[PDB]
Design a binder for this molecule. Structure first.
Ligand SMILES: CCCCCCCCCCCCCCCCCC(=O)OC[C@H](COP(=O)([O-])OCC(O)COP(=O)([O-])OC[C@@H](COC(=O)CCCCCCCCCCCCCCCCC)OC(=O)CCCCCCCCCCCCCCCCC)OC(=O)CCCCCCCCCCCCCCCCC
Ligand SMILES: CCCCCCCCCCCCCCCCCC(=O)OC[C@H](COP(=O)([O-])OCC[N+](C)(C)C)OC(=O)CCCCCCCCCCCCCCCCC
Ligand SMILES: CCCCCCCCCCCCCCCCCC(=O)OC[C@H](COP(=O)([O-])OCC[N+](C)(C)C)OC(=O)CCCCCCCCCCCCCCCCC
Ligand SMILES: CCCCCCCCCCCCCCCCCC(=O)OC[C@H](COP(=O)([O-])OCC[N+](C)(C)C)OC(=O)CCCCCCCCCCCCCCCCC
Ligand SMILES: CCCCCCCCCCCCCCCCCC(=O)OC[C@H](COP(=O)([O-])OCC[N+](C)(C)C)OC(=O)CCCCCCCCCCCCCCCCC
Ligand SMILES: CCCCCCCCCCCCCCCCCC(=O)OC[C@H](COP(=O)(O)OCCN)OC(=O)CCCCCCCCCCCCCCCCC
Ligand SMILES: CCCCCCCCCCCCCCCCCC(=O)OC[C@H](COP(=O)(O)OCCN)OC(=O)CCCCCCCCCCCCCCCCC
Ligand code: SF4
Ligand code: SF4
Ligand code: SF4
Lengths: 188, 178, 155, 67, 257, 115, 318, 52, 144, 56
């Protein structure tokens, strides 16, 4: 309904974004308030390549200047196509609190969101905020991406201090990403 | 001439009357009581505060505040684009690009103060040979934004089209002192 | 009715924030002298519910008096990023608004607004103590006209 | 002038009389018009637990008229 | 104090930063109702000191909190370069109004308060008491003031009257040069050491034939006193090091320049 | 029991007043206002190092006297003994040896803030 | 019918404290020739509600380097205790009479310290570790004397029950027998209740908002609610232990009415102090109170032991 | 709490009003001298108005 | 006497501002009840009382009015009011008000004075009042 | 003026000196406003003769 209204429009289709005051890493980070993490299928069957904000923003800002991108769709995905169980284990090794799974089906883990969806404020979860995490599955096929727009995207291995250094306790408030065992990346 | 301030120590073989005089300063710490009665002397005074927006304190005709471009009694913008009011403005605040007015006269097309500059020093109202730029007695012109302090020429003539009843009285009160 | 209740709550929520706002023991230049003369017995802050507390955690507004140098700048945003976030800002002076003198020097930031966002700007080289007082009465209505519960109902 | 202080005092001054005068009228209501009848020793507790046993279980009453 | 900012605002325009004392003497004369108010201010200020000097110069706390703090000796102050009040507070009789009177201070009688045992309370008294001997000088500077002129009588160094530059030409030219270029001082160099209340406020001008200068330089009394904050803070703890800084008359403008 | 009715309240008056302080301010906690203060800079050391006090000896003389204070407290009942001449003397003997113990330290530079 | 007595015992002290925040800003003002609050209410009568309702909307800082358990428990422990000290405090007949009703005060008075130590120790900061340590050597200083200045008074009274003093003062104030005790008590009511001419712990000018600086609005009020609530106790005791108002038991509201008249003075007497005197540098306060008051205390402690036995004046154990 | 060695880092208010006088004439630099000691204004003007 | 002459002098303050609806208004709106000689009542409602017996800060006070230029100044009271003929008076610059020493009108000066337009519309936005100082080119509509 | 002569004696005593003569709240003793206009004296050297700048 945009192409049929304003053709020759740029449409960026980014992956699930992370950054300071995000809703992606600071989501799984705050599962620690409960007993543990209820993530589906022990995390597997959910392949994810997240992307950093500035990679998206530097992509937009350069898309509003090229003679290219007069209709070209895009996909701002980033490298290191992680797997969710290892994507979260990285977070809770970075955020040194603890990590034990607590697997579930969508029979209940989509209903818990309907309990927290009954919040007049900014909810902690929803019917659908549970399901984006689990729909999240894609392989890059043909689309242009960042690297043919101006940006050389950033891996999550590097800019994860800045967004999880808050979620730690004293006795882990300085821990040097030299430490913490980088995640296992899947190519498929 | 020099004056000693703390120099009195001389053991006069202090008599027992001068001991209690000292031994009751201590054990009743009375030198401090002379301070408590001193602050008790002030709550019973009239507090000098003034209800500000209803009682705005005293000023004088030379109080220099918000700039304004005065105007002759028959219209005719009193500025003549000399440029000896940015050649002296030490904060480097004024840009007064000019032209012939198309009457053949000589007036500004541009005038400016960056009031985030403008040290409020008075060099521009005392340098102006025509009494065009003055520095009015405003002091309530705070702004929520940075752009409202970049008075160019239309915010600054009509400002002078506002306070001219209040400026000229002070200028008339002071053209003998300057 | 719900909106009328929320407008009055949001008018009643602000009465506290605007009356009892606790500015912060800043300094740095001549301009700060006038804040003392605004703590003085002529134009009393305390009569307006305005109190110096010298810690940001206890604070509700920053008053930036004086040239905000490049060395002081980290210590100015390390401090603005230590309050809670109903935090407000006030820029006393022409050294803090634009850097009036020292706009072209090398060790001076050309405005408090380069670094911390600001609600109000008080001009004057030494703005009269009855000219911050006009500002922190104007900041005292700039958030009388904030609608933080209204735009929650319609959202 | 200084007389503007009295509201802060005489409203604070109708605020520390209550916990004194309320502490008695609330005792008399509960204790039957008498005082709370404090017990510091083991004897004054015996008289209560005696007087508790010469009536209904409340102890702020019966005396002579019986025998 | 605000009662004295009205003695600038009633004289200059600005309460605080009054560009009033120029090389060409003084920009602008007094108005008719000014000295008659300093008298009504000066007769009473001497009691307000007594209303404070009472509150502080006889306590224990003030006298047990400042005393024996900052016992910087005589010959080490000079090695450190204090020169203002942190040396006469230790007994060095020195002042640039009895030794180097620059403006009218020759014919101004007053006393230079000196104190032995300089320990942040003995210089306090030297600081409360030069408020008196200056209040003594107002009694003189108000009484004797000759009915003369107010700026230098030399229109190439001090601009003419704002009405003299509307009848006459030359006054209009010099007005058009003084307030555009300047007046072309000759090349040279000086050191005007002045006793501000902090002390020897110095200015090392270096001129050239231009109307601009060539490297002024300012001597901050406080750039030498704050370096004395290292030896005076020896033996003394956190709660009275906080008092040393106030017994140097610190202002972080003159120094940080 | 009557006091538990007074004091479980005051915990709740405090505990009910704190839950309505964390869950009713609308917070925005991110990184740099949570980190410690030291007056507009990043703290050099770690805030949890040896303080190395200087009144170390007086803290002990208090630690000994809080016993001695406790060792006085039964005097309001001791006067209600029939002797009141050993209570007389032995109350002088306790207070005197204290001042002797206090005056020795007073001269041997105990309560003087080593420096 | 007991909860309706607590409700009329805690509301009328949190509503009083609130207007001590006001009265501590006006009386200090008129001494400074400056009107205090005049505007939010008629004469500032409605400023603490702003101040109170302002503080329960701002972000309670959960600092990144801290102990969030003791962080939250100290203000819970401060507002609890100093509010809970009013329980036995006998306006003529107390809520809770106690034999040892004053050791209840001393002991619980000491736990007002651990709200100041656990706070500043939890909160990682140099300027709060100090304020914690600034209380350690303060409690060490006066607590030797808040007992003996409190014993030797209760030595020519009998039991520690605060209710007995109303009968000991049935015809005279104990200020006249023991003004030396009452002097040092006043200063020891002023070290405890760290609000003072010698604050040393919430030092704005040395230790900026010491023991209190990492604390933002929510937890922050619980100290002001506790400190200005504790100012009124240690003056309310002086209106019981030294200044004995009128019992006359058919109008017991005469005690409570004169109990007002003196407690406000002693609560308004502290206000002249803060506006009149600076601090003791934290080495004098312990050289001012082990050297000058401690021997003078033990003397009068010894004098009041040889006061009744010399004469006859033995207090009875009722 | 006792102080063994302090190390002030004055300089957090440097602006450079020994380098701006270099580009401003002797009247156009007079009010810089009020700023040095912002408490004693005229005593600075009184100094700079003599060296000139 | 004497002790009551204050009371007899402090009672007319209450009973001198009309009645309750007037006294109740001046109090919460200005926070001081004082009787003084009226000399003003400007256009759009500013009263400008006076009392020379009070000290030098409180002998000239304004009592604003509601219904400013569509802004409802019953609580939102400014000092950017007080137009340019009483500013010279209220601020104690001069000794006589603009009734017996009124100013000279000059047929350009405003009649309707505006307060400090802060963040509404009717505020100030800068220009580049310069006539654009360059001219590029005119391509024709005629191909070749 | 706001003294009523029973607080004067208190206020004069608690401080210990007379301050109804040396008060800091200015009423009428001050110089007023709107002073008469002056006629400033021309300095020296305005004397139309024997004033060659080369001499001075
Ligand atoms: C309500 C108060 C606000 C209303 C004020 C008012 O009516 O207009 C100003 C009116 C006139 O005062 P003013 O002309 O502005 O100042 C002159 C004096 O300097 C005012 O101050 P002063 O202390 O110099 O003179 C007042 C007078 C004593 O004034 C008193 O009324 C003392 C308060 C007794 C209660 O002083 C004495 O004579 C000493 C007597 C001390 C006996 C104790 O204020 C009054 O003086 C009236 C007294 C108000 C009594 C307040 C008691 C009630 C407190 C509120 C609870 C309800
Ligand atoms: C009615 C309002 C009360 C006003 C009282 C406040 C003090 C002001 C009095 C004026 C003054 O400052 O005098 C200074 C004067 C000081 O004058 P001085 O400092 O210049 O010299 C003193 C005299 N020599 C040096 C010889 C010792 O005070 C005195 O001289 C005597 C009073 C000091 C002793 C009082 C304090 C100790 C008493 C404590 C016991 C309890 C007292 C009763 C308390 C009642 C409550 C329980
Ligand atoms: C008990 C706590 C209740 C607090 C609110 C009481 C009203 C406060 C007040 O008087 O001023 C409110 C204000 C008026 O005071 P103000 O703060 O806007 O301005 C005062 C005027 N000067 C500065 C000139 C002295 O009225 C309002 O518009 C607020 C409306 C919301 C209040 C709730 C209404 C239902
Ligand atoms: C006096 C002593 C007693 C102390 C307690 C005082 C009792 C009176 C307090 C009444 C005020 C209650 C509302 C205050 C909440 C203020 C926080 C807020 O603004 O929330 C806005 C938020 C608005 O959320 P939002 O939709 O705008 O988005 C939030 C995040 N931003 C804006 C950054 C995108 O929510 C509310 O509306 C608050 C309603 C709270 C009601 C709960 C009861
Ligand atoms: C039988 C039942 C009795 C209880 C049995 C023991 C189990 C109870 C939990 C004790 C262990 C909790 C713990 O680890 O404490 C450290 C924790 C450490 O927490 P922290 O302060 O370091 O912060 C942690 C931050 N987050 C939440 C992000 C991880 O602190 C405390 O809980 C100390 C308080 C102890 C409570 C006991 C005292 C009673 C209250 C005093 C008044
Ligand atoms: C008949 C035979 C039998 C008789 C037996 C009895 C014999 C007589 C006994 C006499 C006792 C005399 C009084 C005892 C108390 C005196 C305490 C004392 O001496 O304090 C001294 C102390 C100063 O000590 P120092 O370090 O030496 O300072 C001087 C250095 N140059 O001073 C101080 O530092 C204290 C300073 C603190 C000031 C704080 C302000 C207090 C505010 C006052 C409140 C006013 C209301 C009073 C209320 C009282 C309580 C009801
Ligand atoms: C946030 C952390 C808070 C935790 C710390 C809370 C501290 C609370 C304050 C400390 C109390 C001080 C010590 C009290 C000792 C009892 C005082 C006393 O001696 O009198 C008790 C009294 C009987 O004594 P008496 O009257 O003399 O005997 C003659 C009969 N009239 O009558 C009695 O017999 C009653 C004795 C028992 C009363 C004890 C009160 C305990 C309150 C519960 C504390 C735990 C909190 C609950 C758990 C919540 C989780 C945190
Ligand atoms: S000096 Fe006066 S007339 Fe000349 S350009 Fe400047 S403002 Fe205009
Ligand atoms: S007052 Fe001074 S700084 Fe301001 S514009 Fe005029 S000359 Fe420039
Ligand atoms: S604007 Fe003027 S008064 Fe303010 S800091 Fe700068 S020079 Fe000083």
């Amino acid at each position: 309904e945009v192409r049929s209204v304003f053709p020759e429009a740029i449409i960026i289709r980014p992956s699930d974004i992370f950054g300071r005051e995000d809703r992606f890493l600071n989501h799984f980070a705050n599962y620690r308030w409960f007993l543990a993490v209820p993530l589906v299928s022990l995390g597997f069957k959910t392949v994810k390549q997240p992307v950093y904000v500035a990679d998206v923003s530097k992509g937009i800002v350069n898309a509003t200047k090229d003679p290219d991108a007069v209709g070209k769709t895009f996909a701002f995905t980033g490298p290191n196509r992680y797997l969710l169980f290892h994507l979260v284990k990285y977070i809770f090794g970075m955020t040194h609190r603890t990590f034990i799974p607590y697997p579930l089906p969508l029979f209940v883990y989509s209903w818990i969101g309907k309990l927290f969806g009954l919040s007049p404020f900014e909810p902690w979860t929803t019917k659908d905020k549970v399901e984006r995490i689990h729909i999240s599955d894609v392989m890059p096929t043909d689309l242009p991406g960042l690297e043919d727009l101006g940006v050389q995207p950033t891996p999550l291995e590097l800019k994860s201090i800045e967004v999880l250094r808050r979620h730690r306790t004293y006795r882990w408030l300085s821990s040097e990403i030299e430490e913490t065992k980088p995640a296992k990346t899947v190519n498929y | 001439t020099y004056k000693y301030v703390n120099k009195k120590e001389q053991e006069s073989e202090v008599d027992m009357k001068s001991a209690t005089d000292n031994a009751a300063r201590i054990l009743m710490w009375t030198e401090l009581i002379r301070g408590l009665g001193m602050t008790l002397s002030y709550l019973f005074r009239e507090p000098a505060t003034i209800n500000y927006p209803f009682e705005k304190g005293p000023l004088s005709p030379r109080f220099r505040g918000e700039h304004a471009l005065r105007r002759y009694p028959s219209g005719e913008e009193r500025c003549i684009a000399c440029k000896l009011c940015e050649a002296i403005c030490p904060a480097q605040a004024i840009t007064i690009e000019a032209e012939p007015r198309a009457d053949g006269s000589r007036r500004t097309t541009r005038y400016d103060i960056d009031m985030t500059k403008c040290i409020y020093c008075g060099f521009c109202q005392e340098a102006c040979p025509v009494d065009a730029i003055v520095e009015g007695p405003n002091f309530e012109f705070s702004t929520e934004t940075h752009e409202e302090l970049l008075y160019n020429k239309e915010k600054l003539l009509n400002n002078g089209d506002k306070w001219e009843a209040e400026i000229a009285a002070n200028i008339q009160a002071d053209y003998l002192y300057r | 009715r719900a909106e009328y209740v929320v407008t009055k709550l949001d008018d009643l929520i602000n009465w506290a924030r605007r009356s009892s706002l606790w500015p912060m023991t800043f300094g740095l230049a001549c301009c700060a002298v006038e804040m003392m003369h605004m703590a003085a017995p002529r134009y009393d802050m305390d009569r307006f519910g305005v109190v110096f507390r010298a810690s940001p955690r206890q604070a509700d507004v920053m008053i930036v008096a004086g040239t905000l140098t490049n060395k002081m700048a980290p210590a100015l945003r390390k401090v603005y990023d230590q309050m809670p976030e109903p935090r407000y800002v006030v820029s006393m002076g022409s050294c803090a608004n634009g850097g009036g003198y020292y706009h072209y020097s090398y060790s001076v930031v050309r405005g408090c607004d380069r670094i911390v966002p600001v609600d109000i700007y008080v001009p004057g080289c030494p703005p009269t103590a009855e000219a911050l007082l006009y500002g922190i009465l104007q900041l005292q209505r700039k958030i009388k006209r904030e609608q933080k519960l209204k735009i929650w109902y319609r959202r | 002038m200084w007389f503007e202080i009295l509201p802060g005092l005489a409203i604070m001054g109708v605020c520390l009389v209550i916990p004194g005068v309320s502490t008695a009228y609330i005792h008399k209501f509960t204790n039957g018009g008498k005082e709370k009848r404090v017990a510091r020793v083991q004897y004054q507790w015996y008289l209560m637990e005696r007087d508790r046993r010469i009536s209904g279980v409340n102890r702020y009453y019966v005396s002579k008229g019986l025998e | 104090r605000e009662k004295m900012f009205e003695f600038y605002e009633r004289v200059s325009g600005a309460r605080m930063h009054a560009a009033y004392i120029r090389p060409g003497g003084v920009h602008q004369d007094l108005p008719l109702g000014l000295l008659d108010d300093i008298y009504e201010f000066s007769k009473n200020f001497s009691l307000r000191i007594d209303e404070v000097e009472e509150m502080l110069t006889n306590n224990r706390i003030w006298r047990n909190r400042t005393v024996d703090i900052g016992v910087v000796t005589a010959e080490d102050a000079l090695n450190y370069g204090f020169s203002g009040v942190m040396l006469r507070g230790s007994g060095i009789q020195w002042d640039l109004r009895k030794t180097q009177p620059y403006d009218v201070y020759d014919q101004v009688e007053f006393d230079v308060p000196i104190g032995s045992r300089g320990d942040c309370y003995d210089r306090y008294l030297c600081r409360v008491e030069e408020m008196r001997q200056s209040l003594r000088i107002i009694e003189q500077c108000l009484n004797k003031m000759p009915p003369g002129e107010i700026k230098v009588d030399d229109a190439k160094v001090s601009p003419p009257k704002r009405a003299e530059m509307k009848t006459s030409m030359e006054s209009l030219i010099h007005h058009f040069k003084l307030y555009t270029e300047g007046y072309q001082v000759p090349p040279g160099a000086t050191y005007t050491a002045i006793e501000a209340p902090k002390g020897e406020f110095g200015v090392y001008l270096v001129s050239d034939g231009s109307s601009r200068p060539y490297r002024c330089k300012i001597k901050a009394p406080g750039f030498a006193h704050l370096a004395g904050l290292d030896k005076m803070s020896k033996g003394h703890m956190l709660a009275d090091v906080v008092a040393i800084i106030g017994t140097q008359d610190i202002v972080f403008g003159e120094i940080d320049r | 029991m009557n006091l538990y009715t007074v004091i479980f309240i005051n915990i709740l008056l405090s505990l009910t007043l704190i839950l309505v302080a964390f869950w009713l301010p609308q917070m925005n906690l991110y990184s740099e206002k949570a980190n410690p203060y030291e007056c507009g800079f990043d703290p050099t050391s770690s805030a949890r190092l040896p303080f190395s006090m200087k009144f170390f000896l007086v803290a002990i003389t208090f630690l000994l006297f809080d016993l001695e204070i406790a060792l006085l407290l039964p005097l309001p009942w001791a006067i209600q003994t029939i002797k009141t001449s050993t209570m007389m003397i032995m109350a002088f003997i306790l207070v005197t040896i204290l001042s002797l113990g206090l005056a020795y330290e007073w001269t041997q530079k105990g309560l003087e803030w080593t420096e | 019918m007991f909860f309706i007595n607590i409700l009329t015992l805690l509301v009328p002290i949190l509503i009083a404290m609130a207007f001590l925040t006001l009265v501590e800003r006006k009386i200090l003002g008129y001494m400074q020739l400056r009107k205090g609050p005049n505007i939010v209410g008629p004469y500032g009568i409605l400023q603490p509600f702003a101040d109170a309702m302002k503080l329960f909307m701002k972000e309670p800082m959960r600092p990144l380097t801290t102990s969030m358990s003791l962080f939250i428990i100290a203000p819970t422990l401060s507002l609890t205790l100093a509010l809970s000290l009013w329980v036995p405090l006998p306006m003529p007949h107390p809520l809770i009479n106690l034999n040892l009703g004053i050791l209840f005060i001393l002991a619980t008075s000491s736990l007002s310290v651990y709200s100041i130590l656990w706070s500043g120790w939890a909160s990682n900061s140099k300027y709060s570790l100090f304020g914690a340590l600034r209380a350690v050597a303060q409690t060490i200083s006066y607590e030797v004397t808040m007992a003996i200045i409190l014993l030797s008074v209760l030595l020519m009274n009998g039991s520690y029950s605060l209710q007995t003093l109303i009968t000991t003062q049935e015809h005279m104030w104990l200020l006249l027998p023991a003004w030396p005790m009452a002097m040092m008590w006043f200063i020891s009511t002023l070290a405890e209740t760290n609000r003072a001419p010698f604050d040393l712990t919430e030092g704005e000018s040395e230790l900026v908002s010491g023991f209190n600086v990492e604390y933002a609005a929510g937890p922050f009020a619980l100290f002001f609610m506790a400190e200005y609530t504790n100012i009124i106790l240690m003056n309310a005791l002086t209106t019981i232990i030294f200044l004995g108002p009128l019992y006359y038991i058919n109008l017991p509201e005469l005690y409570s009415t004169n109990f007002m008249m003196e407690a406000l003075l002693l609560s308004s007497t502290f206000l002249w102090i803060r506006a009149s005197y600076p601090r003791f540098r934290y080495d004098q306060l312990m050289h001012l109170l082990w050297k000058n008051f401690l021997p003078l205390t033990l003397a009068l402690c010894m004098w009041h032991i040889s006061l009744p036995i010399f004469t006859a004046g033995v207090p009875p154990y009722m | 709490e006792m102080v063994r060695k302090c190390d002030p880092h004055i300089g957090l208010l440097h602006r450079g009003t020994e380098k701006l006088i270099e580009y401003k004439t002797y009247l156009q630099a007079l009010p810089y001298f009020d700023r040095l000691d912002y408490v004693s204004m005229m005593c600075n003007e009184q100094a700079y108005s003599i060296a000139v | 006497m004497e002790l009551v002459e204050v009371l007899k002098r402090g009672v007319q303050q209450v009973t001198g501002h009309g009645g309750l609806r007037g006294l109740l208004r001046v109090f919460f709106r200005a926070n001081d009840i004082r009787i003084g000689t009226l000399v003003g009542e400007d256009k759009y409602g500013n009263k400008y009382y006076e009392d020379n017996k009070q000290f030098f800060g409180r002998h000239r006070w304004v009592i604003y009015t509601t219904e400013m230029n569509g802004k409802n100044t019953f609580w939102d009271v400014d000092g950017s009011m007080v137009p340019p003929e009483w500013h010279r008076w209220l601020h104690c610059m001069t000794d006589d008000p603009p009734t017996t020493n009124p100013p000279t009108a000059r047929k350009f000066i405003w009649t309707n004075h505006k307060f400090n337009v802060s963040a509404t519309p009717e505020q100030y936005v800068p220009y580049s009042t310069t006539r654009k100082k360059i001219h590029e080119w005119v391509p024709p509509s005629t191909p070749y | 003026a706001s003294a009523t002569r029973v607080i004067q004696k208190l206020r004069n005593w608690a401080s210990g000196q007379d301050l109804q003569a040396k008060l800091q709240l200015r009423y009428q003793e001050i110089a007023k406003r709107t002073q008469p206009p002056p006629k400033l004296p021309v300095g020296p050297s305005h004397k139309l003769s024997n004033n060659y700048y080369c001499t001075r």
